[PDB]
Amino acid sequence: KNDWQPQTKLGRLVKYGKISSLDEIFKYSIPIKEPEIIDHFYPKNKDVQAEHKLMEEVLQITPVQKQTQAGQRTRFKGFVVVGDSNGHIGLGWKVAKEVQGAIKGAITHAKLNMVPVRKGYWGNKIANAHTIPQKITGKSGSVRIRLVPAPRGTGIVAAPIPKKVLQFAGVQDIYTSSQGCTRTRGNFLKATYYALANTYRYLTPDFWGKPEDNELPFETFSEFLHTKA
Amino acid sequence: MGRMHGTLAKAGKVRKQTPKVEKKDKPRKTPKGRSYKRILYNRRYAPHILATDPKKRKSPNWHAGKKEKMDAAA
Amino acid sequence: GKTYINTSKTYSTPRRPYEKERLDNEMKLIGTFGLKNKREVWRVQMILAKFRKAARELLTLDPKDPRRLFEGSALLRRMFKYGLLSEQERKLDYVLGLTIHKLMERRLQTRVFKLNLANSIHHSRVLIRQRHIKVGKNLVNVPSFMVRTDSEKSIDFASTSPLGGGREGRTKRKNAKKSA
Amino acid sequence: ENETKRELVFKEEGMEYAQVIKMLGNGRLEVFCFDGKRRIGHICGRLKKKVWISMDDIVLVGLRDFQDDKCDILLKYLPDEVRNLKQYGEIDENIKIND
Amino acid sequence: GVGKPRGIRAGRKLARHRKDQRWADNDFNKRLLGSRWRNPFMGASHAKGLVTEKIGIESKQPNSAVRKCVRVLLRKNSKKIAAFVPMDGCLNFLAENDEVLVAGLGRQGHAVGDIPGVRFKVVCVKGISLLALFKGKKEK
RNA sequence: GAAAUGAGAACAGUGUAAAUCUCUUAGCGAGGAACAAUUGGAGGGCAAGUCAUGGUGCCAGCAGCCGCGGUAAUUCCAGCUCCA
Ligand SMILES: [Mg+2]
Ligand SMILES: [Mg+2]
Ligand SMILES: [Mg+2]
Ligand SMILES: [Mg+2]
Ligand SMILES: [Mg+2]
Ligand SMILES: [Mg+2]
Ligand SMILES: [Mg+2]
Ligand SMILES: [Mg+2]
Ligand SMILES: [Mg+2]
Ligand SMILES: [Mg+2]
């Protein structure tokens, strides 16, 4: 059973090669619950040179304890980052009693959590947006992270963890600032992620004009969906 | 717990006890300087190593003993 | 003893003594450019950093500003002569984009080797330390010599050494002077 | 009742026989040594685990070169090992062993 | 609000307020009143002394061992100091009443690890190093 | 397998108030414990052991901090290897 049968309307729309690009899903803000939709846009034919290669990384694995009916019952938590270096990043975490299990479930989670980082210009606008449009802030638990845009080739100035996240996002050049208890790795990761996410939340002056008015994919593709397969 | 011979708290005990084992006489020698970092680059960051799966890359000290250098060369 | 000669520091030491990604990159550099000794890469890093501080301060400034005009001009003219910058990028912004990979590529080792004058990035480093190469009007015994785009024309072997038509060295002499 | 028979161990050089005098705490005690000196002993990490010691027990004591005033409690003697010591003629026949 | 003046004539109150609150920072306090100079080293990096006693020191919980030590009479101070003697059977390299070189343990005035309260270590014996002696480079 | 060369060491020449050293240079000066780099580390922080390694068995000792050692020590004493 290596063939994917979509349980989501969006899932159908994706598998059958109807919705064009991933970012489009992001645009119409269609919830992705199915961790297939994502592997779709990232083909496993394995051409080594694409920067659109989708990357997975285990970050954390934690032995979590419970006190239950006189026993001490351990599970594992894990954190996972997924990203193509080009614009797209997700973070996920899962608890399970078997390690490789926690890992798989967390990969799946992270995929469901995919988010569109926005890339801006520091100084004069020439070629590759190497950084963020504004300064922004992640907040998780106690922790805070501030992302400030840096000039060309500054590189990522940031702790090992948020650095890893940012590299997955494909921010080349950045300045970091962190508050809170940062050694809480899940909160640090979370913060960096949410921060990276807020890039598109910020209304910058270039976003000021009237947007395009389009119909949702579902309204256009309504005919397709109501055929019975 | 009925095994005791030496006085507790004697000063040089463990060092005195330790057998003297002689450092092996090396055939030839370890290259000093740049050449050494060449050697390291070779056995570590060289093209063939990079070509192999980065998650399956083999850790630098994995072999203490020579039987696994024989198993590594085969 | 009073003395007015100036102080120097050519390199810098990282905040973080052990980090894999960095160590690995540094050994990829040491590998490809045939260096020894991490500080060589560090001093290259230092140099680049100086360049970048310059460009940055200049970008603070108004584009009209006399100082940015003159000193910026000077920085880019300074790039060409070393061939760190291609013909087309004379804008200060492209300075920042400078790679250590480009800058090490301007080494005399990197130059001699890639000039088919030496078999190996290592063969090179002995050669220019063996006193076997001339650059311009001088004899350069230094691996770290940053190469004038203009002197790239005249890089050939020393008229002093063999490979320069000079007498075969003490080795060949001692081998050959023992008959039968 | 007893733990497995093992050879009664004698005072080697650098050790002395001792009898427990009073209890200090922190695993310490004052001992009368058959050297003829009183000392303040500490209890072995080994003995802290196994054998509980109390007052007027006969113990073997590892000594210290530098500080003679402190000594380490090495091992406790079972009353039979003791009566045997008296037999052998190691420690003096007039001594009080209590059960 | 913020309980802190913001105003352009507020300068001195601000700076004075800091010149006060700064005292709660410990390193500042210890620095500012001479604290360094009164310590057994008299501000110094190391010190020379004479050995009064060789002494064993039973380790803090939960560890058991006998930490080899010495009580030294510092030649500059004439203060008495309790110092640790490092590595293995190095207590043997010491004779009572030698010249001895003593340094901090790396906590700057505080004890390290299982040795309770002992703030100093032995570096040199007579003229030579404990390291030199240990590895057996030189002889006493 | 022969080439390459400086450290060493020298005629001369450069240099000096003179002397030394440098620099230029004849006659010399490389195949292995020599012309042989160390100093600190391989549990985490922190790069490096998944030694069925030997010794010691809470002792000797390690450990900036957490901790390691109580007879199968990833932490002591050593050997190998490996790291900076
Ligand atoms: Mg902080
Ligand atoms: Mg402070
Ligand atoms: Mg320190
Ligand atoms: Mg403690
Ligand atoms: Mg050594
Ligand atoms: Mg002369
Ligand atoms: Mg040779
Ligand atoms: Mg050590
Ligand atoms: Mg063992
Ligand atoms: Mg070891």
Short mmCIF file of N, CA and C (backbone and C1' of nucleotides) in Angstrom, two decimals, chain B residues 3 8-15 17-19 21 23-26 28-29 32 36 40 43-44 59-64 69, chain F residues 32-34 36-38 42 48-52 54-61 70-71 76-84:
data_model
loop_
_atom_site.label_atom_id
_atom_site.label_comp_id
_atom_site.label_asym_id
_atom_site.label_seq_id
_atom_site.Cartn_x
_atom_site.Cartn_y
_atom_site.Cartn_z
N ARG B 3 37.95 -8.79 51.08
CA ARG B 3 39.21 -8.74 50.36
C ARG B 3 39.91 -7.41 50.63
N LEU B 8 44.59 1.32 53.51
CA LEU B 8 43.82 2.37 52.87
C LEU B 8 44.59 3.67 53.07
N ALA B 9 44.48 4.59 52.11
CA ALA B 9 45.09 5.92 52.20
C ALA B 9 46.59 6.05 51.91
N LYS B 10 47.27 4.94 51.60
CA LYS B 10 48.66 5.04 51.14
C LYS B 10 48.75 5.89 49.87
N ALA B 11 49.82 6.67 49.76
CA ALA B 11 49.90 7.78 48.80
C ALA B 11 49.99 7.41 47.32
N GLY B 12 50.94 6.56 46.95
CA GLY B 12 51.19 6.32 45.54
C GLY B 12 50.50 5.09 44.98
N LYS B 13 49.53 4.56 45.72
CA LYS B 13 49.10 3.17 45.58
C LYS B 13 48.84 2.71 44.15
N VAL B 14 47.92 3.39 43.48
CA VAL B 14 47.44 2.93 42.20
C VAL B 14 48.51 3.09 41.12
N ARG B 15 49.29 4.16 41.22
CA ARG B 15 50.33 4.41 40.24
C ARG B 15 51.46 3.41 40.40
N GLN B 17 51.19 0.41 41.70
CA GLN B 17 50.68 -0.90 41.30
C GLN B 17 50.70 -1.14 39.79
N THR B 18 50.32 -0.12 39.02
CA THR B 18 50.18 -0.23 37.57
C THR B 18 51.45 -0.79 36.91
N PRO B 19 51.30 -1.83 36.07
CA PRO B 19 52.46 -2.46 35.44
C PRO B 19 53.10 -1.48 34.48
N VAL B 21 54.12 -0.68 31.02
CA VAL B 21 53.94 -1.14 29.66
C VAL B 21 54.68 -0.15 28.77
N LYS B 23 55.81 1.94 25.42
CA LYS B 23 55.23 2.50 24.22
C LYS B 23 55.81 1.81 23.00
N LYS B 24 54.95 1.40 22.08
CA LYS B 24 55.40 0.62 20.93
C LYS B 24 56.34 1.42 20.03
N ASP B 25 57.37 0.75 19.54
CA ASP B 25 58.31 1.39 18.64
C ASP B 25 57.62 1.49 17.29
N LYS B 26 57.52 2.71 16.78
CA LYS B 26 56.81 2.93 15.54
C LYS B 26 57.70 2.71 14.33
N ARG B 28 58.79 3.75 10.88
CA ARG B 28 58.82 5.11 10.34
C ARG B 28 58.32 6.13 11.36
N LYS B 29 57.55 7.11 10.92
CA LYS B 29 57.11 8.19 11.80
C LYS B 29 55.87 8.95 11.35
N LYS B 32 55.05 15.58 10.56
CA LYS B 32 54.79 16.87 11.18
C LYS B 32 54.21 17.85 10.17
N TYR B 36 50.60 16.54 7.71
CA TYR B 36 49.69 15.88 8.64
C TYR B 36 48.24 16.28 8.34
N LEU B 40 44.97 14.10 7.35
CA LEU B 40 43.64 14.26 7.93
C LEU B 40 42.58 14.55 6.88
N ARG B 43 41.87 11.27 4.96
CA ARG B 43 41.06 10.26 5.63
C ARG B 43 39.72 10.79 6.16
N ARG B 44 39.48 12.09 6.04
CA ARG B 44 38.26 12.69 6.61
C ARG B 44 37.38 13.50 5.65
N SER B 59 32.51 7.53 11.96
CA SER B 59 33.19 8.37 12.93
C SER B 59 34.68 8.05 13.09
N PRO B 60 35.53 9.10 13.08
CA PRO B 60 36.99 9.09 12.98
C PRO B 60 37.76 8.09 13.86
N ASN B 61 37.34 7.85 15.09
CA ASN B 61 38.04 6.89 15.96
C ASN B 61 37.45 5.47 16.06
N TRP B 62 36.44 5.16 15.24
CA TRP B 62 35.63 3.94 15.44
C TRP B 62 36.46 2.69 15.70
N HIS B 63 37.63 2.63 15.10
CA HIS B 63 38.53 1.52 15.33
C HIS B 63 39.63 1.91 16.30
N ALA B 64 39.71 1.19 17.42
CA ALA B 64 40.91 1.21 18.23
C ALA B 64 41.92 0.25 17.63
N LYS B 69 40.54 -2.57 11.01
CA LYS B 69 41.19 -1.94 9.86
C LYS B 69 41.26 -2.99 8.75
P G F 32 67.69 4.57 6.29
"O5'" G F 32 66.56 3.68 6.97
"C5'" G F 32 66.28 3.75 8.36
"C4'" G F 32 65.89 5.15 8.79
"C3'" G F 32 64.76 5.27 9.79
"O3'" G F 32 65.13 4.97 11.11
"C1'" G F 32 64.47 6.87 8.10
P A F 33 63.98 4.80 12.21
"O5'" A F 33 64.48 5.71 13.41
"C5'" A F 33 63.86 6.96 13.69
"C4'" A F 33 63.85 7.16 15.18
"C3'" A F 33 65.21 6.92 15.83
"O3'" A F 33 65.97 8.10 16.04
"C1'" A F 33 63.64 5.38 16.68
P A F 34 66.19 9.18 14.88
"O5'" A F 34 66.71 8.35 13.61
"C5'" A F 34 68.09 8.33 13.23
"C4'" A F 34 68.43 9.36 12.16
"C3'" A F 34 68.86 10.72 12.69
"O3'" A F 34 69.70 11.33 11.70
"C1'" A F 34 66.94 11.00 11.40
P A F 36 65.27 16.27 13.95
"O5'" A F 36 64.38 15.07 13.38
"C5'" A F 36 63.26 15.32 12.54
"C4'" A F 36 62.05 14.52 12.96
"C3'" A F 36 61.44 14.92 14.30
"O3'" A F 36 60.52 15.98 14.17
"C1'" A F 36 61.77 12.58 14.24
P A F 37 60.95 17.45 14.63
"O5'" A F 37 60.05 17.71 15.92
"C5'" A F 37 59.11 16.74 16.39
"C4'" A F 37 58.45 17.20 17.66
"C3'" A F 37 57.10 16.57 17.96
"O3'" A F 37 56.87 16.72 19.35
"C1'" A F 37 56.80 18.86 17.60
P U F 38 56.65 15.47 20.32
"O5'" U F 38 56.21 16.18 21.67
"C5'" U F 38 57.04 17.18 22.23
"C4'" U F 38 56.38 18.54 22.26
"C3'" U F 38 55.25 18.73 23.25
"O3'" U F 38 55.70 18.89 24.58
"C1'" U F 38 54.67 19.72 21.19
P A F 42 39.29 13.97 28.84
"O5'" A F 42 38.83 13.30 27.47
"C5'" A F 42 38.13 12.06 27.47
"C4'" A F 42 37.38 11.85 26.18
"C3'" A F 42 37.34 10.40 25.69
"O3'" A F 42 36.25 9.64 26.17
"C1'" A F 42 38.30 11.74 24.04
P A F 48 33.11 14.54 17.77
"O5'" A F 48 34.27 13.47 17.88
"C5'" A F 48 35.30 13.41 16.91
"C4'" A F 48 36.48 12.69 17.48
"C3'" A F 48 36.11 11.52 18.38
"O3'" A F 48 35.93 10.33 17.66
"C1'" A F 48 37.64 12.95 19.49
P G F 49 34.73 9.33 18.01
"O5'" G F 49 35.45 7.98 18.43
"C5'" G F 49 35.82 7.74 19.77
"C4'" G F 49 35.76 6.27 20.11
"C3'" G F 49 34.72 5.90 21.16
"O3'" G F 49 33.69 5.08 20.62
"C1'" G F 49 36.91 5.05 21.74
P U F 50 32.13 5.38 20.91
"O5'" U F 50 31.44 3.95 20.78
"C5'" U F 50 31.22 3.13 21.93
"C4'" U F 50 31.42 1.67 21.63
"C3'" U F 50 32.70 1.30 20.90
"O3'" U F 50 33.20 0.08 21.43
"C1'" U F 50 30.81 0.65 19.59
P C F 51 33.96 0.11 22.85
"O5'" C F 51 34.37 -1.40 23.11
"C5'" C F 51 35.67 -1.73 23.58
"C4'" C F 51 36.68 -1.65 22.46
"C3'" C F 51 37.74 -2.74 22.47
"O3'" C F 51 37.97 -3.21 21.14
"C1'" C F 51 38.77 -0.58 22.63
P A F 52 37.16 -4.51 20.64
"O5'" A F 52 36.43 -5.06 21.95
"C5'" A F 52 37.04 -6.02 22.80
"C4'" A F 52 36.39 -6.03 24.17
"C3'" A F 52 36.89 -7.12 25.11
"O3'" A F 52 36.92 -6.66 26.46
"C1'" A F 52 34.58 -7.49 24.58
P G F 54 41.67 -7.30 29.31
"O5'" G F 54 42.90 -6.81 30.19
"C5'" G F 54 44.16 -7.46 30.08
"C4'" G F 54 45.23 -6.67 30.79
"C3'" G F 54 44.92 -6.26 32.22
"O3'" G F 54 45.08 -7.30 33.16
"C1'" G F 54 45.77 -4.41 31.05
P G F 55 44.26 -7.25 34.54
"O5'" G F 55 44.88 -6.03 35.34
"C5'" G F 55 46.23 -6.06 35.77
"C4'" G F 55 46.61 -4.77 36.44
"C3'" G F 55 45.77 -4.36 37.64
"O3'" G F 55 46.13 -5.05 38.82
"C1'" G F 55 46.05 -2.50 36.22
P U F 56 45.00 -5.53 39.86
"O5'" U F 56 44.49 -4.17 40.52
"C5'" U F 56 45.42 -3.23 41.05
"C4'" U F 56 44.74 -1.95 41.45
"C3'" U F 56 43.50 -2.11 42.30
"O3'" U F 56 43.84 -2.25 43.67
"C1'" U F 56 43.10 -0.53 40.56
P G F 57 42.87 -3.05 44.67
"O5'" G F 57 41.90 -1.92 45.22
"C5'" G F 57 40.67 -2.28 45.81
"C4'" G F 57 39.51 -1.65 45.10
"C3'" G F 57 38.16 -2.24 45.47
"O3'" G F 57 37.26 -1.17 45.77
"C1'" G F 57 38.44 -2.26 43.11
P C F 58 37.26 -0.61 47.26
"O5'" C F 58 35.71 -0.69 47.68
"C5'" C F 58 34.96 0.43 48.11
"C4'" C F 58 35.55 1.72 47.61
"C3'" C F 58 35.52 2.90 48.55
"O3'" C F 58 36.53 2.77 49.54
"C1'" C F 58 34.97 3.60 46.36
P C F 59 36.78 3.90 50.64
"O5'" C F 59 38.36 4.09 50.62
"C5'" C F 59 39.01 4.65 49.49
"C4'" C F 59 40.32 3.97 49.20
"C3'" C F 59 41.39 4.84 48.55
"O3'" C F 59 42.06 5.65 49.50
"C1'" C F 59 41.29 2.74 47.46
P A F 60 42.57 7.13 49.11
"O5'" A F 60 43.56 6.88 47.89
"C5'" A F 60 44.83 6.28 48.08
"C4'" A F 60 45.52 6.05 46.76
"C3'" A F 60 45.62 7.27 45.86
"O3'" A F 60 46.73 8.10 46.18
"C1'" A F 60 44.75 5.47 44.62
P G F 61 46.57 9.70 46.23
"O5'" G F 61 46.38 10.11 44.71
"C5'" G F 61 45.27 10.90 44.30
"C4'" G F 61 44.83 10.51 42.91
"C3'" G F 61 43.87 11.46 42.21
"O3'" G F 61 44.49 12.61 41.66
"C1'" G F 61 43.04 9.30 42.02
P G F 70 33.41 0.77 40.81
"O5'" G F 70 33.81 -0.24 41.97
"C5'" G F 70 34.58 0.20 43.07
"C4'" G F 70 34.06 -0.35 44.38
"C3'" G F 70 33.05 -1.48 44.27
"O3'" G F 70 33.70 -2.74 44.07
"C1'" G F 70 32.30 0.15 45.84
P U F 71 33.07 -4.18 44.45
"O5'" U F 71 32.61 -4.78 43.05
"C5'" U F 71 32.66 -3.99 41.88
"C4'" U F 71 33.35 -4.69 40.73
"C3'" U F 71 32.77 -6.04 40.27
"O3'" U F 71 32.54 -6.01 38.87
"C1'" U F 71 35.13 -6.19 40.52
P C F 76 40.20 9.26 33.33
"O5'" C F 76 41.19 9.03 34.56
"C5'" C F 76 41.29 9.96 35.62
"C4'" C F 76 41.75 9.29 36.89
"C3'" C F 76 43.05 8.50 36.75
"O3'" C F 76 44.19 9.30 36.96
"C1'" C F 76 41.40 7.13 37.74
P C F 77 45.24 9.51 35.76
"O5'" C F 77 46.38 8.44 36.03
"C5'" C F 77 46.57 7.84 37.30
"C4'" C F 77 47.37 6.57 37.15
"C3'" C F 77 48.09 6.41 35.82
"O3'" C F 77 49.35 7.07 35.80
"C1'" C F 77 46.90 4.43 36.31
P A F 78 50.09 7.40 34.41
"O5'" A F 78 50.20 5.99 33.68
"C5'" A F 78 50.32 5.89 32.27
"C4'" A F 78 50.31 4.44 31.82
"C3'" A F 78 50.19 4.21 30.33
"O3'" A F 78 51.42 4.35 29.65
"C1'" A F 78 48.69 2.78 31.47
P G F 79 51.45 4.98 28.17
"O5'" G F 79 51.02 3.78 27.23
"C5'" G F 79 51.76 2.56 27.22
"C4'" G F 79 51.09 1.53 26.36
"C3'" G F 79 50.52 2.03 25.04
"O3'" G F 79 51.50 2.15 24.02
"C1'" G F 79 48.88 0.75 26.13
P C F 80 51.43 3.38 22.99
"O5'" C F 80 50.24 3.00 22.00
"C5'" C F 80 50.39 1.93 21.08
"C4'" C F 80 49.06 1.41 20.61
"C3'" C F 80 48.24 2.34 19.73
"O3'" C F 80 48.68 2.35 18.38
"C1'" C F 80 46.85 1.40 21.39
P U F 81 49.10 3.74 17.67
"O5'" U F 81 47.71 4.39 17.24
"C5'" U F 81 46.84 3.72 16.34
"C4'" U F 81 45.39 3.98 16.66
"C3'" U F 81 44.90 5.40 16.42
"O3'" U F 81 44.59 5.64 15.06
"C1'" U F 81 44.11 4.62 18.52
P C F 82 45.02 7.02 14.37
"O5'" C F 82 43.90 8.06 14.84
"C5'" C F 82 42.53 7.82 14.56
"C4'" C F 82 41.66 8.58 15.51
"C3'" C F 82 41.87 10.08 15.56
"O3'" C F 82 41.23 10.75 14.49
"C1'" C F 82 41.75 9.24 17.76
P C F 83 41.87 12.11 13.92
"O5'" C F 83 41.36 13.23 14.94
"C5'" C F 83 39.98 13.35 15.24
"C4'" C F 83 39.73 14.21 16.46
"C3'" C F 83 40.26 15.63 16.40
"O3'" C F 83 39.39 16.48 15.69
"C1'" C F 83 40.72 14.66 18.53
P A F 84 39.96 17.69 14.81
"O5'" A F 84 40.52 18.72 15.88
"C5'" A F 84 39.62 19.60 16.53
"C4'" A F 84 40.25 20.33 17.69
"C3'" A F 84 41.38 21.29 17.36
"O3'" A F 84 40.89 22.53 16.86
"C1'" A F 84 41.94 20.00 19.27
#
